[PDB]
């Protein structure tokens, strides 16, 4: 199959204002449904949904990616790697119902951007234009990463998504959000204390906590601290590899730098595989509910 080209196509007649309204609806529901997952809220799962719907991309043939919004098809939403994301999709259902004009890919990705910003993270420029593609364009399961591997695995894995060392380490800071759930992934526990506030806590915890390699109730190894935090073997690999370690230390000591680098890497992740016409609108930077006094 020849390398497909996905050209961004703006939803008919829509502009910044239309998308800010969708952002707002998502942000308002995030505030409303705050009891989810023992009051962590839907922020983390929406970020993970944005990542997993974008992370199926393969730079070699442009298959997968955020463009098609293929997670709406059974093969992909039933991917074992996506266990638990159905909660995020259900959250977005009423949003898509109110704004039926937005594409699935635009909604999934915008959900992640909205969550990060509302959780006090950096502003993440976002571009519209993803177009829904047929069920036969859904990528096969197995493109998302395993968590029981080492640094070499992580480095090699992300090369498929065209991410370098700094981009990988910056992206990983998102694990400051939410937690692992034994029933979903075979891992259990949060990475930090501020589960629904976007900060550089992930890096400080990796470096400052005293970690012990233990077996959880699913008989899988994970690193645990007496504080009640955990790290996946892939997370811990960031301090085992000397190159990753240097970057982890940088972000643990510069919140602004982490925010700026994460913003760039996350937008890149959400845009991989998409060709934006020269005359396409500039990226949108949405105002938070707080900035709008809403
Ligand atoms: C090395 C690559 C990665 C691996 C192996 C990996 C494994 C897991 N990630 Fe995660 N991840 C991102 C966001 C989030 C978020 C948010 C969650 C929390 C979900 C929740 O419902 O709380 C979240 C949960 C989990 C879980 C637990 C799922 C569950 O049990 O519910 C696993 C096992 N992740 C990213 O954005 C990204 C790219 C950077 C940090 C990124 C990279 C990797 N992630």
Q: Where are the domains of the chain?
A: 4-144+266-294, 145-265
Beta bridge partners, 189, equal 180
Q: Do strands 230-231 and 221-225 pair parallel, antiparallel, or not at all (unpaired)?
A: antiparallel
Query: What sign results for the dihedral spanned by CA atoms 37, 185, 263, 205?
Result: positive
Out of 90, 180, 181, give the residue to mutate to test ligand 1, the one with the largest number of ligand atoms within 8 Å of its CB.
180
Q: Which experimental approach was used here?
A: X-ray
State residue 6 phi and psi, 5-degree precision. -105, 105
User: Residue 16 has which token pair?
Assistant: 């910044």
Residues belonging to the chain? 294
Cα separation, 162 vs 157, whole angstroms: 9
175 is in an annotated binding site: yes
- Nearest Cα residue to atom 27 of ligand 1: 180
- Nearest Cα residue to atom 29 of ligand 1: 180
Question: Of 58, 25, 137, 263, which is closest to residue 33 (Cα–Cα)?
Answer: 25
Question: Of 166, 175, 183, which is closest to residue 234 (Cα–Cα)?
Answer: 175
- The distance of Cα 176 from the centroid of its chain, to the nearest Å, equals 12
Q: Are 145 and 154 in contact (CB under 8 A)?
A: yes
Cα separation, 290 vs 42, whole angstroms: 18
Q: Do strands 274-275 and 6-7 pair parallel, antiparallel, or not at all (unpaired)?
A: parallel
Q: Is the CB of 234 under 6 A from ligand 1?
A: yes
Q: Is the CB of 232 under 6 A from ligand 1?
A: yes
Burial class of residue 231, CB neighbours in 10 A (0-12, 13-18, 19+): buried
191 is catalytic: yes
Q: Are 89 and 79 in contact (CB under 8 A)?
A: no
Out of 48, 124, 186, 251, give the residue to mutate to test ligand 1, the one with the largest number of ligand atoms within 8 Å of its CB.
48
Among 52, 96, 126, 223, the active-site one is: 52
Q: Is the CB of 147 under 6 A from ligand 1?
A: yes
Cα separation, 162 vs 76, whole angstroms: 22
Residue 268 alpha carbon to ligand 1 centre in Å: 17
End-to-end Cα spacing for the chain = 48
Cα separation, 49 vs 84, whole angstroms: 9
Q: Is the CB of 222 under 6 A from ligand 1?
A: no
Beta bridge partners, 63, equal 58
Report the atom number in ligand 1 closest to the C-alpha of 184.
Answer: 30
Q: Are 185 and 147 in contact (CB under 8 A)?
A: yes
Q: How many Cα atoms are found within 13 Å in the side-chain-facing hemisphere of 106?
A: 25
Position of tokens 């043939």?
A: 61
Q: Which CATH architecture has domain 145-265?
A: Orthogonal Bundle (1.10)
Burial class of residue 281, CB neighbours in 10 A (0-12, 13-18, 19+): middle
Burial class of residue 180, CB neighbours in 10 A (0-12, 13-18, 19+): buried
Cα separation, 263 vs 113, whole angstroms: 9
Question: Of 4, 286, 1, 51, which is closest to residue 174 (Cα–Cα)?
Answer: 51
Question: Of 173, 231, 171, which is closest to residue 202 (Cα–Cα)?
Answer: 173
3-state SS of the chain? CCCCCEECCCCCCCCHHHHHHHHHHHHHHHHHCCCHHHHCCCHHHHHHHHHHHHCCCECCCCECCCCCCHHHCHHHHCCHHHCCCHHHHHHHHHHHHHCCCCCHHHHHHHHHHHHHHHCCCCCCCECCCCCCCCHHHCCCCCCCCCCCCCHHHHHHHHHCCCCCHHHHHHHHHHHHCCEECHHHHCCCEECCCCCCCCCCHHHHHHHHCCEEEEECCCCCEEEEECCCCEECHHHHHHHHCHHHHHHHHHHHCCHHHHHHHHHHHHHHHHHCCEECCCCCCCCECCCCHHHHCC
Cβ neighbours, 10 Å, residue 23: 24
Q: Are 155 and 86 in contact (CB under 8 A)?
A: no
Cβ neighbours, 10 Å, residue 97: 8
Residue 175 alpha carbon to ligand 1 centre in Å: 6
Position of tokens 């643990």?
A: 252
R_g of the chain, CA atoms, integer Å:
18
Burial class of residue 116, CB neighbours in 10 A (0-12, 13-18, 19+): buried
Cα separation, 207 vs 205, whole angstroms: 5
Cα separation, 209 vs 235, whole angstroms: 13
Residue 48 alpha carbon to ligand 1 centre in Å: 6
- Nearest Cα residue to atom 7 of ligand 1: 147
Report the atom number in ligand 1 closest to the C-alpha of 195.
Answer: 22
User: Residue 10 has which token pair?
Assistant: 């703006």
Q: Is the CB of 186 under 6 A from ligand 1?
A: no
User: Residue 62 has which token pair?
Assistant: 């442009």
Class of domain 4-144+266-294: mainly alpha
């Amino acid at each position: 199959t020849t390398p497909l080209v996905h050209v961004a196509s703006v939803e008919k007649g829509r502009s910044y204002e239309d998308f800010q309204k969708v952002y707002n609806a998502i942000a308002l529901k995030l505030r409303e449904d705050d009891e989810y997952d023992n009051y962590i809220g839907y922020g983390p799962v929406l970020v993970r949904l944005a990542w997993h719907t974008s992370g199926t991309w393969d730079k070699h043939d442009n298959t997968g990616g955020s463009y098609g919004g293929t997670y709406r098809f059974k093969k992909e939403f039933n991917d074992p790697s996506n266990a638990g994301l159905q909660n995020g999709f259900k959250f977005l259902e009423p949003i898509h119902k109110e704004f039926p004009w937005i594409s699935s890919g635009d909604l999934f990705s915008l959900g992640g951007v909205t969550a990060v910003q509302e959780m006090q993270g950096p502003k993440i420029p976002w571009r519209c234009g993803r177009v829904d593609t047929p069920e036969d364009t859904t990528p096969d399961n197995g493109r998302l990463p395993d968590a029981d591997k080492d640094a070499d695995y992580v480095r090699t894995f992300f090369q498929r998504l065209n991410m370098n060392d700094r981009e990988v380490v910056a992206l990983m800071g998102a694990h400051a959000l939410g937690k692992t759930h034994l029933k979903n992934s075979g891992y259990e526990g949060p990475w930090g204390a501020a589960n629904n506030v976007f900060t550089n806590e992930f890096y400080l915890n990796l470096l400052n906590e005293d970690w012990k390699l233990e077996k959880n109730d699913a008989n899988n190894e994970q690193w645990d601290s007496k504080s009640g935090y955990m790290m996946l073997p892939t997370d811990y690999s960031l301090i085992q590899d000397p190159k990753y370690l240097s970057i982890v230390k940088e972000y643990a000591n510069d919140q602004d730098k982490f925010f700026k680098d994460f913003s760039k890497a996350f937008e890149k992740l959400l845009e991989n595989g998409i060709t934006f016409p020269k005359d396409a609108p500039s990226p949108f930077i949405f105002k938070t509910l707080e900035e709008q006094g809403l």
